[PDB]
Amino acid sequence: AAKDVKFGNDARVKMLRGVNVLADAVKVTLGPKGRNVVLDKSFGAPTITKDGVSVAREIELEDKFENMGAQMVKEVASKANDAAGDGTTTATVLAQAIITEGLKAVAAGMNPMDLKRGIDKAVTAAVEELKALSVPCSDSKAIAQVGTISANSDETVGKLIAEAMDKVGKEGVITVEDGTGLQDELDVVEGMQFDRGYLSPYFINKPETGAVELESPFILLADKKISNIREMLPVLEAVAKAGKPLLIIAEDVEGEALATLVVNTMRGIVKVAAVKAPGFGDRRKAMLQDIATLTGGTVISEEIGMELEKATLEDLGQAKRVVINKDTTTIIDGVGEEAAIQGRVAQIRQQIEEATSDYDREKLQERVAKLAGGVAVIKVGAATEVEMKEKKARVEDALHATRAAVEEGVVAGGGVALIRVASKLADLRGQNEDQNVGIKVALRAMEAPLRQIVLNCGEEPSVVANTVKGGDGNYGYNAATEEYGNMIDMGILDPTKVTRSALQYAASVAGLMITTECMVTDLP
Amino acid sequence: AAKDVKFGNDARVKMLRGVNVLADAVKVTLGPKGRNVVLDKSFGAPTITKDGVSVAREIELEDKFENMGAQMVKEVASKANDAAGDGTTTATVLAQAIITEGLKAVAAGMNPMDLKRGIDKAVTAAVEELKALSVPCSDSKAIAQVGTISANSDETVGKLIAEAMDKVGKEGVITVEDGTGLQDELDVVEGMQFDRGYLSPYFINKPETGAVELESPFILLADKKISNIREMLPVLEAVAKAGKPLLIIAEDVEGEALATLVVNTMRGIVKVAAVKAPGFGDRRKAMLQDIATLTGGTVISEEIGMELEKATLEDLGQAKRVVINKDTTTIIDGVGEEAAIQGRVAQIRQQIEEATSDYDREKLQERVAKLAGGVAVIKVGAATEVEMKEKKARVEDALHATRAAVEEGVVAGGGVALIRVASKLADLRGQNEDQNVGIKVALRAMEAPLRQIVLNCGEEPSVVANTVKGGDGNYGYNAATEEYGNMIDMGILDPTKVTRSALQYAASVAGLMITTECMVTDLP
Amino acid sequence: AAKDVKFGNDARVKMLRGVNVLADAVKVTLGPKGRNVVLDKSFGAPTITKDGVSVAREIELEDKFENMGAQMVKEVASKANDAAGDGTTTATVLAQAIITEGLKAVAAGMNPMDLKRGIDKAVTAAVEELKALSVPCSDSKAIAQVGTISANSDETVGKLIAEAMDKVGKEGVITVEDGTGLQDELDVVEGMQFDRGYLSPYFINKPETGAVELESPFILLADKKISNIREMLPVLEAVAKAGKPLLIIAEDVEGEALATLVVNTMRGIVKVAAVKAPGFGDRRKAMLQDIATLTGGTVISEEIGMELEKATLEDLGQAKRVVINKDTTTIIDGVGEEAAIQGRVAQIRQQIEEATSDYDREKLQERVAKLAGGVAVIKVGAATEVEMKEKKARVEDALHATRAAVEEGVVAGGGVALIRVASKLADLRGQNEDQNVGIKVALRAMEAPLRQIVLNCGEEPSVVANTVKGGDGNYGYNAATEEYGNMIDMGILDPTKVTRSALQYAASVAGLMITTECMVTDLP
């Protein structure tokens, strides 16, 4: 189709307008005293939310170039959220600050590539400073404290998360399920999790969670890429008559098979989720065999000769529950002989014993760990169904935050880690003057989020920023109580991973938009 | 003719727009780092000035109501400048701050009259605080220091001002004249100054200062109101054939005589300035007799018998030089035998002892003081004519500033006296909540000028404002050196009269606009 | 009248547009390969010129704000031309470069005052570097060489200039005149020159040179300011019936006297030029008496007793020729007794002998020098009237250039002195980063004129600029011959005063325009 092309200054101005619109939409929700945004719905009842994720998801501009700018910032913020579990608003406001200042500098006549180099150097130094400033969260007490902070200052959720980490390990798999009774239940069941996601977004059973959830589904284990529906059509009919959902994992699913699976899911006649197999080659085959051992099923292997057409229901694997997300897939409580699992892990241990290369030893150890560790299940209990759902959501959020914390520690939250890092880095220099300007741009951008928070609070931004800068360590300004102190002891924590990811993704998108020269869109 | 009438909110909005235009025009020239404003001229060469007085004088808008707002802010600022010798920009920015906040509060629903009452109460308390904070300027060292500060840190001007004040007295009259030689000369001549001014601006000889200056002029002394030109026509003809200027003082000059004199002033055939007689009643006749004794002329009084037609050149009083301003008129070195002056002052003293009432004694003492004190003339000299004119202008400005200082002391200049006073008054209260809102409005408005100065300096206004508020006394921020400390020690001095007048006039005009409800203007 | 007010960015943008228009109009006429500009005339035949002064004079824009910007740049360029005799185009192009870069920086968020400080610092360092780089032009050989270079490589003009300098002195007064015969004639006659100029441009006899010239005029000498024409109707009538012009010099001429003199000059019935007396006070009276001795006239002083009506034709001073310019007035061949001049010079020298203070000694020394040195008259002779006028114009231009050269030496012309200086100042630094940006702006602006010259020549600007920067000393690029080498040897000489004045005035106007925030101009 005919295209509209913008060059240089005009394209950058349009992108800046789009970024400004999206950032002004999402920034008012930043901070404990953040405002709320009204999102319209076709149903009739508007939705009022203080969550920046929803506001970002609902933003799309009429102008095409401004739309591209908004979509770029939205995509990088979503990547930050997926990597960390928070910081979408922080990443967006940081990106807006860097983009605005960098475009001002570019309009001043400075070299965009040198500006990007300076931004990258400043951000790398900032990541180093953040790693220096982070405090570990390895002890169970710190884990419980972080979990309590994440779940709106609830001690029960923190205690539950700490118990789960103690039972399964900090690197173990923990999932949250509904609790039958009033009291909460924690148990460890056989299961495993891999890094493959769903093939199609239409598989999403729960749009609010954004993940596919199946109750007692069937497992298909194929060593070949699935392309024709007719190959597994008898299996699909057997699943449909069985009345239970089906989860299929193989090399790949493409073409008419994927199309008909999507159509069936939309019609809802059969609940089928398509997920690729983990790894590749010998590794995908070994992990498929491991999953077969876990679920008690059989791998449909072409070299063996076993075929999908002759596959039966009893040959398929079975699990009590599976959760599929775009980033990972979890198998929870697969039915299978414990003796079979013990034999499999013993075989993997032997393979480690005669393993020679360190890479193979590490891979086999990872496999045996993810096979023998199991999955810890958290059953959230409450008196009322609605409060039980709210508690489950809070527990999920706290679990994600605690995972990030145990991954990378915690820093002084509320946007003061960035201002402290900028204060430490104020003496950085680059090879060229434009690099120095880029470094200053990055420093001011890292200043920005705390200013936005305290502007949402209604307080003076510059004065609070100066006061926090004059301090040291984790000393900072508390938005809720409107009074300074040690941010760690006051209960305002942010995992180091969240801040680091937000800063890095904001820097990347800002550099990409600063070094942008041409813009190609469809005509209105 | 037809009129356009605005009611309530929209009229106040037009005021806000006009005041905003004028205040943004004049407020950028505030502070040592103040910007400059380019003013167009019909001749062709634009004028670049950092003086808020000229910028205010040039401002006149096209919308009639915005023009009203700008014109009345201009009028009150001009009144402040005339009363104090400086502070037009400060008065205008203070008025804009009060007007903006008060109009916002009025639109919020608070009663305008209560807001005006609160503003007046806060301003009265602020005047009291300013009087408390002012340091005296009575000693000659402080007088010299203030004079030096006023004349761009020049010690010679301050020393000249201090020694002239010591020679003639603080209440004495000091006049600046061109010096023939390189060195500066000061001499005391016989003369006096009264508060009457010229009838119309069309007599202004030099538009730069807006004052009438005459070299060796003639003095006309009439105890009757001048209305007809033909009464003094022979006197005017004698003056014209003599070639020297003439100064006429009488009860009043109006009608055909005033019209003919003004037309002659534009035509330039005869240069005559018209000034009303000082005082009223028998006091007026006594002061006219004193003028006659000083200048050696004769008073043309109807009751005595002589007529202006019978008046001759010898009957006219003669002086070496006179200066006429709309605020006061000065008679310098009037020629006359010193024996007559001694007899007249002995006569005034004998009424001094024979008088009984305190009012009459005080007024006679004032008369004898102003008659026997004389006039101190400062002859400013330099190497070349242009720098001599520049030094004369600097000396005149320093003289005005030192007169204000000895009148009411000095305070910490640079706009920090107002912020200190607001910090002191932060605990004020009123009868009604609307009065409290007005008080807070006045406090923030007094904060505003320092914020404007430090914004012109490029620094953050809020941080500097709170840093100054944290201190006490005359501790403040130096705009020129970009560093804090004691404002008096740094030589940043503002006369207390200047700040007091600016605050009071800004408050008055702001109350007038806040309580304004209707407007009448000609149609476009 | 109603005014239009622009604030901040809009005003600066309009100024940038106006300056761009003016600088593009005048910049094409820079360098030996400079293009030519066609200017309209009311007569019908357009004027084609390569002279940037005329192009700048004719420029005037419709938009009021752009017109104000252009007029400011025009005014500073004209001041530079008056001070130096050349460099209007260089000043304008330098001003445009600084203004463009500084406005870019201001839009980038730099502090305008710090930018102006950096510009001033860099320009001061550049002036010091220029003084270091200048070579003296004191000996007669260099004077003749510079005169030859200025007059299109004509050795005769150089030799006449050199011999005139030898005869009267480098600080003497030299004036050019039409030659009766073919041979050029030089002679020294009595006369003097003072810095006072004409009161109004309407006195200009010949607009081509912008100066007032009179043949055998009468001299009026008054110690008092002239305001009334009635004082000198008889003298004017006597002059008119005599038929020769009249030159009047007094303290000042204002009002109806100036108006009627302008009217008489416009009508042409009586041609009289009015110039203020030199000096002020006692020095002014002494200089007037010296002029009276020189021209044989009498000073009409009120205090001595004589008066203007009492003045006659014989009392008026007489001179063979006088030239009046807005910067100075020259009296040439004033007829007077040689014995009177000898007595006056002996009196002045013995007054010097008895003089004590250094300032009085210097004043009397300059008086005696300007009274006894005389005026050297150059009679430019040729064979044809038109070529005689062309040679006279060339000789006058060469005289101006030689005066500038002997004042401050010569540097490598053709715009390479500025590029060399900017090369030397590569390591200059300021207190703030904004000051450094301003310094870089000034350096690039000083680069600009050579780039413009070589762009007019059609060659590559950047390559030539870098080649000249790589060199050192007076090495540079020749525009006429398109080949590098030493610029002094090729005869591309610009007086150091011209380049220094152009740079300083461009910097001043650029700082004024960078620090400008508001405008006031009449509505369209």
Side-chain angles (χ1 to χ4, degrees), chain C residues 308-516:
Chain C
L308 293 162
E309 278 80 356
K310 272 74 188 174
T312 45
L313 287 184
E314 55 93 12
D315 289 314
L316 292 203
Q318 186 53 67
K320 292 291 114 176
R321 181 167 175 261
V322 303
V323 178
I324 296 91
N325 184 23
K326 78 185 158 279
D327 296 339
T328 187
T329 285
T330 317
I331 314 300
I332 308 154
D333 204 6
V335 61
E337 175 45 45
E338 204 275 340
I341 305 309
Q342 289 310 109
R344 204 52 196 282
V345 70
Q347 186 264 340
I348 297 293
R349 81 174 66 258
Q350 63 84 30
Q351 184 178 2
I352 301 180
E353 294 304 316
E354 59 89 20
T356 61
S357 65
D358 67 325
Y359 160 93
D360 281 352
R361 268 188 273 99
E362 291 297 326
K363 281 302 173 288
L364 296 174
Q365 176 57 47
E366 62 88 19
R367 260 174 272 175
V368 75
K370 85 177 179 182
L371 188 57
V375 170
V377 177
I378 295 186
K379 292 183 182 297
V380 172
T384 317
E385 198 270 339
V386 64
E387 73 186 359
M388 183 278 288
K389 297 293 183 182
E390 202 278 335
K391 199 179 166 63
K392 176 184 172 73
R394 271 194 290 125
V395 166
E396 182 171 356
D397 178 35
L399 183 55
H400 268 73
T402 301
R403 192 84 75 173
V406 306
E407 268 197 66
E408 293 214 9
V410 294
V411 292
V416 304
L418 292 166
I419 191 67
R420 177 79 45 233
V421 164
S423 311
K424 286 187 179 183
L425 298 177
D427 58 343
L428 203 54
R429 282 304 174 283
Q431 319 156 37
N432 190 12
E433 295 302 321
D434 300 335
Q435 292 205 358
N436 297 350
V437 167
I439 291 171
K440 290 317 170 183
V441 159
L443 301 185
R444 257 177 281 132
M446 293 182 286
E447 301 203 13
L450 175 71
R451 290 168 168 269
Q452 177 50 40
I453 284 176
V454 303
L455 185 82
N456 284 344
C457 298
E459 211 66 33
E460 188 72 31
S462 52
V463 171
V464 170
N466 287 113
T467 306
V468 178
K469 275 191 280 186
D472 48 353
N474 291 294
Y475 170 80
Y477 171 86
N478 192 356
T481 60
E482 317 263 7
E483 57 93 23
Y484 304 95
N486 179 282
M487 314 279 314
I488 315 290
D489 307 347
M490 315 174 197
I492 319 297
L493 292 203
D494 286 332
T496 313
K497 183 177 186 182
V498 175
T499 304
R500 190 256 305 158
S501 291
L503 185 50
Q504 285 181 334
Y505 282 115
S508 78
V509 71
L512 288 194
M513 185 179 288
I514 279 162
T515 61
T516 288

Side-chain angles (χ1 to χ4, degrees), chain A residues 175-503:
Chain A
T175 193
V176 184
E177 293 197 359
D178 297 286
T180 65
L182 183 63
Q183 69 274 16
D184 301 327
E185 299 176 359
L186 161 68
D187 276 323
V188 162
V189 305
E190 301 302 321
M192 61 79 71
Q193 168 179 340
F194 46 88
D195 288 312
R196 252 67 166 174
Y198 54 73
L199 291 179
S200 88
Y202 316 108
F203 290 139
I204 289 172
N205 274 14
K206 261 66 65 175
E208 55 274 19
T209 76
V212 191
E213 193 268 332
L214 308 180
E215 270 90 359
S216 290
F218 274 113
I219 306 307
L220 177 52
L221 305 153
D223 268 335
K224 80 153 194 70
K225 175 175 69 63
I226 314 299
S227 195
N228 189 2
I229 178 64
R230 306 192 287 106
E231 309 152 349
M232 61 79 71
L233 200 57
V235 175
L236 199 60
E237 293 292 325
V239 175
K241 68 95 176 179
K244 305 153 65 180
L246 168 66
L247 171 65
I248 60 158
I249 61 171
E251 299 202 329
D252 201 347
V253 170
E254 286 176 357
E256 80 261 36
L258 180 61
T260 189
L261 259 56
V262 166
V263 160
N264 289 6
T265 50
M266 294 299 291
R267 297 308 180 272
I269 57 170
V270 191
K271 276 76 68 178
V272 188
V275 177
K276 291 176 63 65
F280 48 86
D282 46 353
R283 287 186 58 253
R284 69 176 64 251
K285 298 174 183 178
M287 293 182 286
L288 272 178
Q289 188 62 42
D290 293 315
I291 291 184
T293 307
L294 177 77
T295 68
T298 302
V299 174
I300 313 300
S301 183
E302 306 320 299
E303 59 90 17
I304 296 186
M306 174 40 191
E307 301 304 318
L308 310 166
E309 294 82 353
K310 62 194 182 75
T312 62
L313 271 188
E314 56 89 17
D315 289 313
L316 290 201
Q318 179 60 68
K320 295 287 103 175
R321 187 168 169 265
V322 304
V323 183
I324 295 91
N325 186 27
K326 82 184 161 280
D327 298 336
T328 184
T329 292
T330 312
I331 312 298
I332 309 155
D333 199 4
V335 290
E337 180 62 30
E338 281 73 23
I341 309 307
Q342 287 145 0
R344 201 48 194 282
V345 303
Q347 158 197 346
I348 302 291
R349 206 155 277 97
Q350 300 319 303
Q351 281 182 344
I352 298 181
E353 296 312 309
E354 66 267 12
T356 66
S357 67
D358 63 326
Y359 157 80
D360 278 352
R361 271 191 273 96
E362 193 271 332
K363 283 301 179 290
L364 286 160
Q365 182 56 48
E366 167 69 29
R367 263 178 277 166
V368 76
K370 85 173 178 176
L371 187 53
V375 172
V377 179
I378 291 184
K379 284 184 181 292
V380 163
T384 317
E385 196 264 0
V386 292
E387 74 180 3
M388 183 278 288
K389 249 61 179 185
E390 201 275 337
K391 193 174 164 61
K392 194 169 82 170
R394 271 196 290 116
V395 164
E396 272 288 340
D397 176 36
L399 177 58
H400 211 277
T402 315
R403 191 82 70 168
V406 305
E407 267 193 68
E408 292 218 10
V410 287
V411 296
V416 301
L418 294 175
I419 192 70
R420 182 76 43 231
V421 159
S423 297
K424 285 182 180 182
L425 287 185
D427 64 337
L428 211 58
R429 281 305 173 282
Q431 319 166 44
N432 191 11
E433 290 303 321
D434 300 353
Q435 302 209 6
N436 302 342
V437 175
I439 291 171
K440 293 317 168 184
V441 160
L443 299 182
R444 253 173 281 137
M446 296 175 285
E447 302 206 11
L450 172 75
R451 292 166 162 268
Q452 184 52 42
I453 279 180
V454 304
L455 185 80
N456 285 348
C457 287
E459 207 66 34
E460 191 67 37
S462 50
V463 170
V464 175
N466 263 31
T467 307
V468 179
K469 274 195 277 187
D472 189 358
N474 297 297
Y475 164 81
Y477 174 82
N478 190 4
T481 65
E482 315 268 10
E483 60 88 20
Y484 309 91
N486 181 283
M487 295 299 291
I488 306 293
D489 309 348
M490 293 177 71
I492 321 292
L493 291 204
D494 268 338
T496 315
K497 188 177 183 184
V498 163
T499 318
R500 188 260 298 163
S501 293
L503 183 56

